[PDB]
C-alpha cells in the first residue's frame, strides 16, 4: 500500500493516491528520445525534488505542463509533476518500475 523509490527506499506515494486520469491510472507513453514509460498517475507524492521550470512541450496530458521529478534522496528519475491544467490543476506521473510497493 505505499510506494518507495526502488533505488534507496525514500517514501514517495500511496496506492490510495492513484488517480484515474482519462479513465485509467496507467498510461503507456514515449518521449522524443523514444524511451517508453509505464506511467502511474497519483494525486499526491512526497520525497521528490522537482527540477527546472514547467514545460508544455511534448506533454502527454492535455493542458498540463511538466517538471522532471527526481527522488529527493538519491536523485533517481521517478517521473514528472504536472501543473497548469484543470480538474485537477496538478498531479504526478510516476514511472511504475522505478517504485517499490510494500507495507505501510
Amino acid at each position: 500500500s505505499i510506494f518507495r523509490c526502488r533505488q534507496c527506499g525514500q517514501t514517495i506515494s500511496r496506492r490510495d493516491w492513484l488517480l484515474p486520469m482519462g479513465g485509467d491510472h496507467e498510461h503507456v507513453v514515449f518521449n522524443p528520445a523514444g524511451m517508453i514509460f509505464r506511467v502511474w498517475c497519483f494525486s499526491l507524492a512526497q520525497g521528490l525534488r522537482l527540477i527546472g521550470a514547467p514545460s508544455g512541450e511534448f506533454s502527454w496530458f492535455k493542458g498540463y505542463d511538466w517538471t522532471i521529478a527526481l527522488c529527493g534522496q538519491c536523485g533517481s528519475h521517478l517521473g514528472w509533476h504536472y501543473e497548469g491544467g484543470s480538474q485537477p490543476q496538478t498531479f504526478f506521473g510516476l514511472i511504475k518500475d522505478r517504485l517499490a510497493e510494500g507495507p505501510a
Binding site: 507513453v29 518521449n31 522524443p32 528520445a33 524511451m35 511534448f58 506533454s59 502527454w60 511538466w66 522532471i68 528519475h77 514528472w80 506521473g93
Partner: peptide
C-alpha cells in the same frame, strides 16, 4: 541524460 528524462 536530460533527453532521457523529458516527458
Amino acid at each position: 541524460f536530460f533527453e532521457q528524462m523529458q516527458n
